[PDB]
Amino acid sequence: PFFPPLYLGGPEITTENCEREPIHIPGSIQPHGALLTADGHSGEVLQMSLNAATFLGQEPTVLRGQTLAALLPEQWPALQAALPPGCPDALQYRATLDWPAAGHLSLTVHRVGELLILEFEPTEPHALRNAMSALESAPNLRALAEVATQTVRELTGFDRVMLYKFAPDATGEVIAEARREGLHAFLGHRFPASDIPAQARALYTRHLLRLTADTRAAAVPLDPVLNPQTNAPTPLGGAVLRATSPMHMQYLRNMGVGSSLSVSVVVGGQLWGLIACHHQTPYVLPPDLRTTLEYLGRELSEQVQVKEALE
Numbered sequence: 290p291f292f293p294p295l296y297l298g299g300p301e302i303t304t305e306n307c308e309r310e311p312i313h314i315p316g317s318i319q320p321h322g323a324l325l326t327a328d329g330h331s332g333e334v335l336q337m338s339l340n341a342a343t344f345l346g347q348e349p350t351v352l353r354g355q356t357l358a359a360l361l362p363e364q365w366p367a368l369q370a371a372l373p374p375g376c377p378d379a380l381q382y383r384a385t386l387d388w389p390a391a392g393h394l395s396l397t398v399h400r401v402g403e404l405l406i407l408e409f410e411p412t413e414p415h416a417l418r419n420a421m422s423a424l425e426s427a428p429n430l431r432a433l434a435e436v437a438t439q440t441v442r443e444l445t446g447f448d449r450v451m452l453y454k455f456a457p458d459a460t461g462e463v464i465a466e467a468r469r470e471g472l473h474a475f476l477g478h479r480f481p482a483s484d485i486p487a488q489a490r491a492l493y494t495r496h497l498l499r500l501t502a503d504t505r506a507a508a509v510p511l512d513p514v515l516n517p518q519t520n521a522p523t524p525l526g527g528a529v530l531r532a533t534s535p536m537h538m539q540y541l542r543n544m545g546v547g548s549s550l551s552v553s554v555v556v557g558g559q560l561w562g563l564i565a566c567h568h569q570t571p572y573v574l575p576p577d578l579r580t581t582l583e584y585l586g587r588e589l590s591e592q593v594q595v596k597e598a599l600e
């Protein structure tokens with residue numbers, strides 16, 4: 290059973306209670322983007338990341354309480370029709386914005402209950418179809434693993450891309466990797482289950498991609514921290530901008546990893562493994578490339594089942 294989050298008087302997490310961290314409700318985001326929450330009916334902005342005003346070039350006093358009708362006149366009607374009350378929380382509305390203060394922005398919106406969760410990130414399929422085909426054309430499980438890591442590395446430029454496979458006891462093993470010259474091998478190395486604790490593995494079965502763009506960057510809180518609709522935490526399990534567990538951030542820093550990203554491989558409704566990526570320098574993977582990775586994760590998941598059937 291989860292501890293209360295830090296902003297509800299909960300304790301800072303230690304190695305004695307890894308699995309009790311409520312990672313889905315950190316009440317804060319990573320600073321490379323901005324997040325707003327809004328009422329699902331009225332479009333009233335209910336919460337904003339502390340950096341939202343500066344990030345969007347808006348006046349802090351104007352942004353809170355303002356409506357999505359006023360802030361996003363060209364998207365609001367499309368947004369409403371796309372995400373009606375009761376829709377699956379995995380369902381997304383995406384748009385590209387031309388925003389003077391921040392340049393081209395990717396907007397990603399989801400609904401949870403009566404709340405809309407809006408993520409703004411800077412933004413800039415021939416390669417995708419080729420990548421899809423390379424996975425399918427892979428002859429066996431090992432080659433599929435190898436092609437997957439190589440293809441993901443080519444698409445992303447990440448210093449290391451691993452296929453990290455979970456054993457029945459939830460320990461992990463790197464079973465394939467593609468790596469930059471000079472990086473030491475993790476191939477064949479195994480890791481305790483506690484390195485990716487049970488509540489993370491659970492979240493990763495439902496929300497299939499997560500990342501930390503800068504492992505040294507302080508989280509940016511949401512204000513107000515609680516959803517005013519409910520006087521309860523804002524569900525951020527489906528927000529890629531959500532803050533990463535400090536326990537994990539520390540693990541990455543100690544490994545010399547500045548940027549981390551993984552994609553779930555789900556086989557038969559169970560978490561089979563992860564496409565796990567590292568960069569030494571902080572690194573924001575373009576929003577369009579993340580969508581490509583999401584498609585490739587789905588393809589790999591299908592192909593792992595197919596290839597395991599071949600034996």
Ligand SMILES: *C/C=C1/C(=C/c2[nH]c(/C=C3[NH+]=C(/C=C4\NC(=O)C(C=C)=C4C)C(C)=C\3CCC(=O)O)c(CCC(=O)O)c2C)NC(=O)[C@H]1C
Pocket residue numbers: 303304305306307308310312461463475480483484485486489499500501532533534536537540549550551552563565566
């Ligand atoms: C006491 C808690 C601990 C803890 C928590 C923790 N770890 C994660 C997430 C991940 N851990 C990963 C581990 C590895 N990455 C690697 O490259 C290797 C080995 C080469 C390992 C073992 C991975 C891949 C993740 C997924 C996230 C990612 O891809 O960056 C979480 C959940 C983080 C979040 O989503 O907010 C948590 C709470 N890890 C520990 O070691 C202990 C201290």
